[PDB]
Design a protein around this ligand. Sequence first.
Ligand SMILES: [Mn+2]
Ligand SMILES: [Mn+2]
Ligand SMILES: [Mn+2]
Lengths: 214, 214, 317, 317, 317
Amino acid sequence: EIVMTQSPATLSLSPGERATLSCRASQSVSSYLAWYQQKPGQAPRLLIYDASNRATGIPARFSGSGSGTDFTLTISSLEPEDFAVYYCQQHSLLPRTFGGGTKVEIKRADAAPTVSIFPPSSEQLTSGGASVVCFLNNFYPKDINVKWKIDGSERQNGVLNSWTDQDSKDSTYSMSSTLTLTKDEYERHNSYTCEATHKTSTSPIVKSFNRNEC
Amino acid sequence: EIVMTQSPATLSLSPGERATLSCRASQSVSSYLAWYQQKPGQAPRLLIYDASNRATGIPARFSGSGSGTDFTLTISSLEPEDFAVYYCQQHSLLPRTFGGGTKVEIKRADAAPTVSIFPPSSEQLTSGGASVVCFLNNFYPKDINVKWKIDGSERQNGVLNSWTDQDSKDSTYSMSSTLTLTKDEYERHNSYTCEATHKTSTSPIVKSFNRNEC
Amino acid sequence: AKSRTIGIIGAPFSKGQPRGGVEEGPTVLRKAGLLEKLKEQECDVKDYGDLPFADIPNDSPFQIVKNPRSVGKASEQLAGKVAEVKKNGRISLVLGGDHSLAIGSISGHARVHPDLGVIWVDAHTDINTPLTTTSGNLHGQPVSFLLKELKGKIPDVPGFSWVTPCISAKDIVYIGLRDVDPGEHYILKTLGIKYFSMTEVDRLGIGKVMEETLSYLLGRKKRPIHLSFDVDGLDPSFTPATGTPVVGGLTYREGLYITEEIYKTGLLSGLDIMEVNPSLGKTPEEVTRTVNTAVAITLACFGLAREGNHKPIDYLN
Amino acid sequence: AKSRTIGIIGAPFSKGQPRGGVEEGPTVLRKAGLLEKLKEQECDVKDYGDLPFADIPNDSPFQIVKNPRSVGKASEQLAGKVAEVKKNGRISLVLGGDHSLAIGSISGHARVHPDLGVIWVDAHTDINTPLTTTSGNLHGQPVSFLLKELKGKIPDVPGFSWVTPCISAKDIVYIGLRDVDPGEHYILKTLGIKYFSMTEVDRLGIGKVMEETLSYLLGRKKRPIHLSFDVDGLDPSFTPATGTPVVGGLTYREGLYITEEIYKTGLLSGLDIMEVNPSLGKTPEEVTRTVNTAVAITLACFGLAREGNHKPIDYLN
Amino acid sequence: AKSRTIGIIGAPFSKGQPRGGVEEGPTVLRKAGLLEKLKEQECDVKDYGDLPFADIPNDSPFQIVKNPRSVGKASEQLAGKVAEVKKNGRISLVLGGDHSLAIGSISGHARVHPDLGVIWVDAHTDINTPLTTTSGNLHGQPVSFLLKELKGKIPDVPGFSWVTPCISAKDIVYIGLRDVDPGEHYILKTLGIKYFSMTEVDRLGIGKVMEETLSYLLGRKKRPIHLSFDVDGLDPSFTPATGTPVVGGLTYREGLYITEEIYKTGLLSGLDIMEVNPSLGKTPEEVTRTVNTAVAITLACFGLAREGNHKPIDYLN
Ligand SMILES: [Mn+2]
Ligand SMILES: [Mn+2]
Ligand SMILES: [Mn+2]
């Protein structure tokens, strides 16, 4: 099961210069592997066929090299349509393993998240649930951890974090701190807190509300 | 950073036959690595010096081989004093990485956990805390997940699981579901539940209590 | 004796064939104990080590032929080593690998005995040209480099400058062909090559086939015989762990038989065991059957006959 | 040409045999691409569609014979369709199904050529009578309706009014028999039918067997040959996905061989592929081996010879 | 011409030295483009590929000497390959690796020219014996196997049966010694070996040192010179990515100078670049300085002189 290791896990480079990527083998694949262009929810189309040589509908800038253990994927003329999770994939040993993921983001000026926290509705309370979700918005780069608290004492098993891709226009990111509780647990407490933490956030961004305040 | 991978992660073999273990390299270490005997809280003493040849105070049964990618640690005359977390360790590349862990347990007949659940004291309630812990006891093998519920709705961020080694005499295992709450959260609810789940447990072992029942 | 005097040449080379993994060819045949299974009967076994196969990094392709120069360098190296072990007076046991190596395996054998014969037991003829193949894989073009009747028509594909075609079209017998692409069969019919495919194998019976094969090669004159043997030429019920399995091959019985007729002439002078691939068995049991098959084939080549093998002393003592 | 000019007749019928599931006979053989695997060599392939098999709801049994009228209606319909495709000048590729259909498959073939021969390659003779069987299953009584030497002795079982026995007992050769119930072998010995069972197959060799079979049928006079071929006649190591598997059948090699001798007479004029059943393979791999076997059998009937097949242009160009 | 006619032998071997990682010796020197940086001036460059180093699994230790048989087999193989490339009339560029290989690198060079000289530019003498070392590491015992004045005193350590001591104690000059264990300096003083350590290097000046070195070797008679060159003999400010760095080595200027004096005799006949280790640079910049150093050393050996190199045509045109 030769493990193929992609040394750039993530990548964020502006429309511009070379975006040389790395993929390593645990054996000698020896010029027998390829490169792919998995756009989100699409066909992971071939970039480079046999460690080189640029297959059949490739634009201009997708040279690469190898032969035979640690290979290269050069994106010289970056062309911002190419922002996709890239994959090397060894071939000439069974079973035919893949790389890990080479998310090519957009490099831009680090955006700060706009963070606030939101209750369950009375329409929800007539159904009998509690879903207190904080909503994080327009930041760069991806990494935020959000903590919850039962009036000061932390929460899990409802808490879910889910991120989109990078935006087309302002090129930002995404998270809801999707948390679900019960109506009984809702009514026993007021001060519900959302503690964001981004690289732009020097202090951890806390936004809160009491129950029966809004 | 050549990663050394130990293919037997855990091991449970009776006092008896061969206990051949495996350690693989991401490159050619080429007969340049060793084998260790880390007893819990002790000195991880050398077993086998250079992929073979049995160093200087080794008893009788600790042959091994290699040269040069995927190596062997044979424990032929098992000798039940030898129940320790074992480590291969590559040497002749910098930096000098290690294996993962080769916990050599005792193989015995699968023991069922004795499971029940325990409240906070009034001496605790005069201090103002809540610590509802379930106590799991004398089982084999190690793996149990224990769920908690707020009268039927699950719990985390207090819940802690902690296991000992295997016992000397009956050779069993260990867990407390160490959970901590607040006195206020304690007084708002009664039916506190502990749901064990072991391989011997065909049904998930639920033990419960109401507050002000005991 | 004269026969069962063996020089083993392991040749872990792959770049003629696309399915990488045949370079664990000599490793698995040696760890199945081919050496020691020779050593019961009077086998003068001398291992000459494996050949180093250097990696040309810019082995740039031809029009269709791909990885040419690595194949040509490997077969030139093997031609020197086969000429070396035939100057040692032994029978060249050259096992790989793939049929790309059989270029130098027949070439260096012809460097000592220029008037040999080739029994190319294979599912395929492997006589595509660099121009009129559609693969360009050199595990199926060794025979086209070797026939003198094809000279002036083979391109100067790089790595093959040393290649002198050395055998005649009337001096080669295919046995067990079962899947031929059209270029190879036009060559087969125009040169007048004698061949016994699985049609003619079943027609005469495998024994009358080996009878007429020895009547074709040795019926004119006694001469050295070079059994170059593919392991996909047998049926994939016995060897599924090969590169190109085609159903309908020889039974394992008859493969052993063809080797035993070549032994009982006493004229075995060169042996090839190619296309063994442990990486393509779907179970290791498939690999185990395949490798035990190829080992016992090699045994019955050098006179591990199924009738018996002996040492000439009284055993009632 | 004259040969490899094919009319395909799929006939998904089951009620001669008890194990329901053989009605996915033509479906699996077509989805294995028998049509396109013919079309490489010069196969004039014309699919005539599947035959509709109506369901007689009150197909009331005979004494022992059960589902008689559906079998008789199916074989009468197939006799009309076989006579149609033989008036088209093609070679009738009639594949089902079960041997119950071979009544009309030999009958409509005799409606054009009354002096043909039948090579009934099967594990069984399938010549039980309606009176002296113990099954009453019409997947084993087609041959008893067809021999003129059995007339005045076959009952008027319903559905079989149209049945004229059309072939002579000296004009049929069984090849590969291996399990016969006693009534069929008394018929076999009293009529003086020539047959080569697996005894005689192993005795002469499969090639001398096909040699004497063609010497028996065609040695007197050139005449059309109707290979009606069961797929349990091969060994169940190759076709376990059949209705009645009996161990000890022909090797897959020899099955392909029998078809290739019938091709190289140039006198193939009718072909039956019966008893294919994808529902009885214990794994789908068993079904895959069985169907690829029967497909390549049908290929080697119409001249996908293992020696090679070509189109007559120069390929060095 | 006579000089700058190069046979490159890459030898990725490590088991003489303990710090594993020097087997990426020829890989990094080739990917730094030593071949193409030769090819500007008139360098007849012929790469002969890397040597295969088989792994003896039970390479059991001696008393102190450890991994002996792998070293002896590697140096015997290299002795054959050096004798091969010296029969090719080229200058043997043998780069590894470690000084264990210099046994066969001087041995096969003496197989063609038995009266050569050795300029062993190294921080250490590397002339420990198997008996009177305290390491037993064969990256520091090549010279003790090679001197005829040490015969009858070297043990029969396994792998070294082929070893004939081939050079005289008065036919070797150490240049740049700076850390010697006591056994090696008793050998150095008792044999009367001429040597210029960093004391004598600074005393005469590096130019008067190379003047007297060529006056010692070539002042008697013109004879082939075998510069065997360690890369720790330079100061670790320039090559910190070596196996045994000792501070106080030659400046990079003077290392290039020693190579250029060996060139301007026109008598360079064998070259060793050992102990290059990319795995021990604390930064890759350290590795980059080390490898560019060793590359330009090898350039100034074959006549990439710092004065200039030319092709003899007018360039005002
Ligand atoms: Mn083949
Ligand atoms: Mn049958
Ligand atoms: Mn040194």
